[PDB]
Design a protein around this ligand. Sequence first.
Ligand SMILES: Cc1ccncc1NC(=O)C(F)(F)c1cccc(Cl)c1
Ligand SMILES: Cc1ccncc1NC(=O)C(F)(F)c1cccc(Cl)c1
Lengths: 304, 304
Amino acid sequence: SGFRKMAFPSGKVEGCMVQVTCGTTTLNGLWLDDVVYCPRHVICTSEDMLNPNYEDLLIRKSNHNFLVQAGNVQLRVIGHSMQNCVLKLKVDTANPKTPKYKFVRIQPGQTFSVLACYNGSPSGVYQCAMRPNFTIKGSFLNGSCGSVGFNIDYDCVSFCYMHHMELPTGVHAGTDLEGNFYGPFVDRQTAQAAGTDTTITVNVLAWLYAAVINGDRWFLNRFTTTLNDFNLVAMKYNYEPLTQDHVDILGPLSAQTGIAVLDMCASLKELLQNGMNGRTILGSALLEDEFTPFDVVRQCSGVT
Amino acid sequence: SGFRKMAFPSGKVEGCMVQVTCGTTTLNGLWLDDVVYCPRHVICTSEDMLNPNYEDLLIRKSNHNFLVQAGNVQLRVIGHSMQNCVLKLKVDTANPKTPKYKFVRIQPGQTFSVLACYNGSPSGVYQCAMRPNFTIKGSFLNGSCGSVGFNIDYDCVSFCYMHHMELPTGVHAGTDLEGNFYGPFVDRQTAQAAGTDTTITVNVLAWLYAAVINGDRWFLNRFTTTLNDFNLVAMKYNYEPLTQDHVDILGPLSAQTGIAVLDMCASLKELLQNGMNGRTILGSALLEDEFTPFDVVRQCSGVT
Ligand SMILES: Cc1ccncc1NC(=O)C(F)(F)c1cccc(Cl)c1
Ligand SMILES: Cc1ccncc1NC(=O)C(F)(F)c1cccc(Cl)c1
């Protein structure tokens, strides 16, 4: 019992963190096998970030200009290449701590853990969701670029995010491990609009199931609704429209609790229309959308 | 920018987790140097937990009855001893992954990360606070006993908690690493009263400073208060009385933001008396008390 915003154990990722320095700039790199991945803006000076020509900036750099340090270990760089917004620094030594891993591009609404790092050293771990607008509401300061987001299934780390930048609004933007930004962002010091965000409906419903499993049941009511009716309410309250695909993924939670997905939708509809009336659900006074249905099943069963 | 309920990177602790089995019961153990620490109820059967005589139960056990497994590694047990509510199993091999560590007894109101484990395998990491009533509101299921709470300063892991039990109310109880329970709890399957809990005032104030540092300033007002006046409000709303010692530890945050501690107390007083009026602070619709002033300074500066 109890439900927490749980992050994956970060050990497998900590073993991969290195410091990357180029000229004046230092940030984090991810060392997997004989390659170190880091944001390509490591090659920029503060003045270059206004409108950087990365191809031209990288041409002035040689292998010996990229200083890669794994704490006390100095890595020898034998190749460098830019792939989208990431630099891939080939090193002469494969990381002995390389876990089984994959590079994945996550979907908006999915969750992942972040290992916030500074100067190649881990400082903390937290769980977050990729917002429907492709931003993350993380906790990052200068020097945190290169910190990565990941999920872990059995012994396999699926890397899904690399931190690149903080928008003028205080929200965060980054790329997949192929250097493709999530969302419309560009790695440049320019004001950039993040799209209109929405609340992740399927996740809120999953968290309402976790609340019932753990004893918070006050919000359950005698009503039901339809996908059509619920979606009119979701539209009014800036929630993602619920689809049959979302209902299908809530099947295990509906099956465990015996509460039909549309019956849970009617509880969510009433909470949207009436608020929480000064009460809490799983220690929260708002509707939480950072737990996917898989996260709920995992935490509620005890998956290691 | 951004503020998250950040846990310590769990790597150093993951390397210490083992599975301990005795008879029919399996739980988690912590392997530090040549000793494995685990809850003493590993020696009980379900029937023994009603009113266990641990001294008598441990007398029927020999070194070879304690099966300790570090994933694939089987440890040879050469000694066993009970210290308060923990068993210390001396093994013939020192854990090569033993980090620099200390055993500490934390104070109520302090925070720590928990590495939730099942069958000696880590499943997740989360940050929590030791409640003023010596319980923790964790996320633990059967098999999680032996999971530990910790803090990390530089390269040193200070172990402060070992999970033992879930109270009938769904809250959690455990011990320091010397096996002394936090609070009045006994390791027995009996209904046990947790004391009246309070909200950790100094932590709420610290989190209000973190909110100002990160841009959420709507709650700041033109008022001030005194320790006496604030404490009359804290008493009414079941908050811990604020002391000069608490004001002293808020000094760095008062110094960074230029907001006097008693001026922040007047904002907290108004939030207690009026509520949040449907607004949020750092993504929360309630007053958060799980961040200490040290946690705020650490996260806000980037301590690794
Ligand atoms: C200061 C900070 C705080 C949190 N997270 C990241 C950062 N850093 C940045 O945003 C940046 F200064 F490195 C930058 C500027 C423009 C474009 C890009 Cl790609 C990167
Ligand atoms: C079931 C569970 C869920 C979460 N956290 C822990 C547990 N387990 C327990 O409470 C227990 F059954 F092992 C137990 C019973 C009585 C006394 C003691 Cl010391 C331990």
